[PDB]
Paper text:
Its catalytic subunit RTCB contains a conserved active-site cysteine that is susceptible to metal ion-induced oxidative inactivation. To preserve the function of RTCB under aerobic conditions, the tRNA-LC relies on the flavin adenine dinucleotide (FAD)-containing oxidoreductase PYROXD1 to protect its catalytic center from oxidation. Here, we report a cryogenic electron microscopic structure of the human RTCB–PYROXD1 complex, revealing that PYROXD1 directly interacts with the catalytic center of RTCB through its carboxy-terminal tail.
To visualize the interaction between RTCB and PYROXD1, we reconstituted the RTCB–PYROXD1 complex in the presence of NADH and Mg2+ ions and analyzed it using single-particle cryo-EM. The resulting model comprises a single molecule of RTCB and PYROXD1, indicating that RTCB and PYROXD1 interact with a 1:1 stoichiometry. The interaction involves the C-terminal domain (CTD) of PYROXD1, whose function has hitherto remained unclear, and the active-site cleft of RTCB, spanning an extensive interface with a buried surface area of 1,715 Å2. The molecular reconstruction shows clear densities for the nicotinamide and flavin dinucleotides within the active center of PYROXD1. As in other flavoprotein oxidoreductases22–27, the ligands are positioned by PYROXD1 such that the flavin ring of the FADH− molecule stacks with the nicotinamide ring of NAD+, forming a π–π interaction.
Author numbering:
A (entry chain A): 4 to 432, 475 to 505
B (entry chain B): 11 to 43, 75 to 202, 232 to 285, 294 to 500
The structure:
């Protein structure tokens, strides 16, 4: 009953709620959901609607999905739902879960990465104002659609070979920079310099490689798009100056894309191997969708090796899409891409697992943070982040849809201590981008630095 | 000696391009009637392959010797009756200009066919009365189900918003009729052309033309298989398309499919030694995967020409090459009545036989989505409208995830299934 489920749920603070242990049959640690007054009403309605449904099959309510992740072996900190939390296979979308790599009973969940791997966004600054582009916006749009392949069944213009694909899967952005499709400044302003050192191309399945060879350099269907935008507002002028947004109406472009086919095949290959291992190593899980393997077990190592490869492939795809975007601007505004100042503000991923150093229970541990729908947001003085943002804080790029304005944020110390530096990715395809970002700022897990409005969308 | 590819069609040019990239030290000849100077163009049409002597002769009388030959001669328009000046069928840019000229001078034009050419023309042309007669019960039987026809046909009532032509020849010409009345159209179901009567034949027999279809002495009158007879200034017969096998089949014993194409194996070999084929001329005889099928098009031709070049390169290197992933799942993304149409796998549940189920979610004048699931696993789906879910449906088909637990809610409006399987 709805009033029975309610007993497990209480309010921690004005913008966060708790899921007490026992909400699901086993729970290692409590759950938490981060909400504004508005997006909270929707998060509770999902649970109540599921309760009225007798014996409801599939599409379980997001709050129950947070709890089933809290049942997993090795969860070290609160299973936390970011504002974009919504129904997702296995782990709820927006969920961070962290597991200690030194604990012997641990878990890697494919649903805690996603079916894609390394879906992300790469914003690029440009010296042109909205008045330079507005009279030619249709020419620039056609030049972009001509230069950038889009949609299902599409094939990339950039030549791709099996050897070069294996190199890109093992080598990430370094491969694109070496080829000539990226610049040394692109390597700097990129999450982990766009590199996964644990990637093994020999782990990726042959079917995943077959899907990868032709799809490289293509956006695809779904929420993968490239969009041209203009700066609306500057909430942190120092951050804007640091990233090269000097004034409102400056042009920028967002490239949202990830692993195309290779990721889905790698993820689905993992779920099949995990079903065998869950019976073998007695990993007991509250939902069949939540596949799980011990990190020590070959299945956990294999998916983590595969995830890193698909991340390197996805980063190469983003760099290729960037290369094509620069060429389209260069033709339309009739000059060299560098003279138009097409440098990159940042590149960041919303569907990856990573090993990170966090101090938990007063003692630092190496944890695997599973985040899907969640973007990294490391604190203002974190040693790993770009030198330019080593003072302001790692940029978080938050992507809209349907002409809703996008936002660029930065990472905070409170967000590091509470969420392990985890923030929203974007609005559900009724919880607006604006609501979601205002909560992440109001809860002190992000600091809005820029706002941006789309003018041209290069979807499929 | 030199590799030879026949046809300036998408299959031939893409085969020649890829083959030139695989062997940059040797020349390729694209016979037909730059970025790779390795490919030369002969600009003539062959009359006879000579498979025993490994030779080709063109209309020039030039003789050529092939180490490998890819046949991509495309396909002739089939016609209701060849030789009549009032029948038209679109084939090539010359025929599109002829259609432009005739159309820019005329009214009361009939179209016969429920295939792709007719589906474009009824939306592209305005300012002529379009009489539509189709052998099937509803529009688009080749590309759509009955429920799909009802969505796209309700759009028909509303106002408009030497290689063969590819995905979009309709942009490169202006097609306005003299009447200037936008989308005035009538559809006649189950009908076929009985006979074509010129004005003189009509005057002799003293038969009466049926009145103009609604809610004058024309040049030609066409009788339907029903009791209604109609006149026109000319008639567009789509009639489908037949592979151009006729000039090649003479003198060599090629194995031909039920569609009359050259049968090709999994490595695209034509059942004659050293000879390959791709695009409309070929017919797929290898063991089809459950969610693939061969329909003549620009996308499949491009893919087949690539695979043929890869397979030819494999045989010269002696290496073994596996089948390309484009043959694992059929997908066609296209426009009909200004609506995106993505058909994935067995979109019309073709070949599923008795075992199949249908789940449909549609909003009137917005989008139509249908899902074909043979055993709780998605064999195919029909996607129509502005929906961007085509990658998700593609992935669920090639995974064969057991969706049975997700039940009927796999298409509920409030759940972001695209985000769920991103
Ligand atoms: C009006 C119209 C409209 C459409 C389409 C076709 C037509 C006619 N299609 C179908 C598509 O255009 C076509 O099926 C493919 O381009 C097939 O191309 P091929 O590789 O077979 O060459 P193609 O069929 O174009 O081959 C023609 C060439 O063959 C060569 N040739 C012919 N006879 C020869 C001989 N005897 N000797 C030597 N060479 C010879 C000549 O060089 C000629 O130029 C389509 N597809 C799609 O995906 N979307 C769409 O919207 C449409 N729409
Ligand atoms: N976007 C697209 O899908 C598109 C558009 C145009 C053309 N094309 C392709 O180009 C090729 C040529 O187009 P098409 O429409 O000629 O091919 P098609 O195979 O789609 O047309 C076959 C149609 O011809 C009709 N037909 C055949 N003989 C008939 C007869 N005697 N009387 C009445 N109807 C008869 C059938 O009922 C059927 O509807 C096809 O492969 C087609 O798929 C693609
Ligand atoms: Mg994404
Ligand atoms: Mg994605």
């Amino acid at each position: 009953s709805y009033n029975d489920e309610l007993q497990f749920l209480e309010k921690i603070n004005k913008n966060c709620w708790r899921i007490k242990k026992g909400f699901v049959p086993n729970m290692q640690v409590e759950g938490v959901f981060y909400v504004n007054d508005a997006l909270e009403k929707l998060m509770f309605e999902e649970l109540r609607n599921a309760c009225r449904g007798g014996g409801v099959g599939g599409f379980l309510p997001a709050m129950k999905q947070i709890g089933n992740v809290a049942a997993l072996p090795g969860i070290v900190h609160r299973s936390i739902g970011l504002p974009d939390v919504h129904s997702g296979y296995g782990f709820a979308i927006g969920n961070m879960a962290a597991f200690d790599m030194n604990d012997p009973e641990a878990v890697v969940s494919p649903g805690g990465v996603g079916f894609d791997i390394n879906c992300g966004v790469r914003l690029l600054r440009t010296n042109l104002d909205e008045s330079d582009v507005q009279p030619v916006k249709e020419q620039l749009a056609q030049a972009m659609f001509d230069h950038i392949p889009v949609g299902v069944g599409s094939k990339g213009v950039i030549p791709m070979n099996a050897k070069d694909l294996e190199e890109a899967l093992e080598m990430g952005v370094d491969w694109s920079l070496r080829e000539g499709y990226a610049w040394a400044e692109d390597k700097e302003h990129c999450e982990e310099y766009g590199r996964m050192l644990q990637a093994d191309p020999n782990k990726v399945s042959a079917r995943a490689k077959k899907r990868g060879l032709p799809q490289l350099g293509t956006l695809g269907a779904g929420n993968h798009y490239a969009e041209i935008q203009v700066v609306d507002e500057i909430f942190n002028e120092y951050a804007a100056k640091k990233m090269g947004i000097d004034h409102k109406g400056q042009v920028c472009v967002m490239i949202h894309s990830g692993s195309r086919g290779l990721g889905h095949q790698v993820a689905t290959d993992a779920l099949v191997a995990m079903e065998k291992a869950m019976k073998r190593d007695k990993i007991i899980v509250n939902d069949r969708q939540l596949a799980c393997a011990r990190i020590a077990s070959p299945e956990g190592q294999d998916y983590l090796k595969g995830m890193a490869a698909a991340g390197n492939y996805a980063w190469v795809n983003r760099s290729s899409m960037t290369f094509l975007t620069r060429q389209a601007f260069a033709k339309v505004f009739n000059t060299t891409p560098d003279d138009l100042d097409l440098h990159v503000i940042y590149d960041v991923s919303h569907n990856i697992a990573k090993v990170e150093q966090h101090v938990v229970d007063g003692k630092e541990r190496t944890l695997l943070v599973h985040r899907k729908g969640s973007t990294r947001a490391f604190p203002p003085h974190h040693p790993l982040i770009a030198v330019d943002y080593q003072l302001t804080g790692q940029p978080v790029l938050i992507g809209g849809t349907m002409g809703t304005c996008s936002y660029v944020l930065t990472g905070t110390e409170q967000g590091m201590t509470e969420t392990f530096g985890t923030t929203c990715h974007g609005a559900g395809r009724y919880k607006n981008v604006t609501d979601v970002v205002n909560t992440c700022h109001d809860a002190g897990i992000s600091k809005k630095a820029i706002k941006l409005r789309p003018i041209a969308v290069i979807k499929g | 000696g030199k590799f030879v590819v026949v046809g300036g069609g998408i299959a031939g040019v893409t085969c020649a391009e890829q083959l030139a990239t695989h062997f940059p030290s040797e020349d390729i000849l694209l016979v037909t009637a730059k970025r790779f100077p390795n490919i030369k163009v002969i600009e003539s049409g062959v009359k006879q392959l000579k498979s025993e002597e490994h030779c080709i002769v063109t209309e020039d009388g030039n003789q050529h010797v092939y180490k490998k030959l890819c046949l991509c001669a495309g396909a002739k328009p089939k016609l209701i009756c060849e030789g009549n000046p009032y029948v038209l069928g679109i084939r090539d840019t010359d025929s599109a200009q002829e259609f432009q000229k005739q159309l820019t001078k005329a009214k009361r034009i009939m179209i016969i066919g429920n295939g792709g050419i007719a589906l474009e023309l009824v939306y592209e042309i305005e300012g002529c009365e379009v009489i539509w007669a189709i052998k099937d019960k509803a529009i688009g039987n080749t590309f759509f189900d009955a429920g799909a026809a009802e969505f796209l046909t309700s759009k028909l009532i509303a106002e408009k918003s030497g290689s063969a032509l590819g995905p979009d020849w309709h942009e490169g010409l202006n097609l306005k009729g003299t009447k200037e009345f936008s989308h005035k159209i009538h559809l006649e179901t189950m009908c076929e052309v009985k006979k074509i009567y010129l004005q003189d034949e009509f005057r002799i027999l003293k038969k009466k033309s049926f009145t103009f279809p609604r809610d004058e002495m024309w040049p030609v009158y066409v009788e339907l298989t029903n009791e209604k007879i109609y006149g026109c200034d000319f008639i567009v017969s789509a009639t489908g398309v037949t592979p151009n096998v006729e000039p090649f089949l003479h003198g060599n014993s090629f194995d031909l499919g039920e569609d009359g194409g050259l049968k090709v194996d999994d490595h695209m070999h034509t059942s004659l030694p050293d000879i390959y084929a791709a695009g409309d001329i070929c017919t797929t005889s290898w063991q089809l995967s459950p969610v693939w099928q061969q329909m003549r098009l620009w996308t499949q031709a491009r893919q087949m020409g690539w695979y043929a070049a890869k397979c030819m390169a494999a045989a010269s290197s002696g290496d073994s090459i596996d089948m390309d992933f484009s043959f694992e799942l059929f997908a066609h993304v296209t426009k009909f009545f200004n609506y995106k149409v993505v058909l994935l796998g067995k979109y019309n549940a073709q070949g599923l036989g008795s075992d199949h189920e249908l789940m449909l979610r549609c909003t009137k004048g917005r989008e139509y989505i249908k899902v074909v699931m043979q055993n709780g696993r998605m064999m195919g789906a029909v996607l129509i409208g502005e929906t961007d879910l085509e990658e998700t449906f593609e992935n669920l088909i090639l995974n064969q995830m057991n969706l049975s637990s997700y039940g009927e809610d796999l298409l509920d409006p409030n759940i972001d299934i695209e985000d769920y399987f991103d």
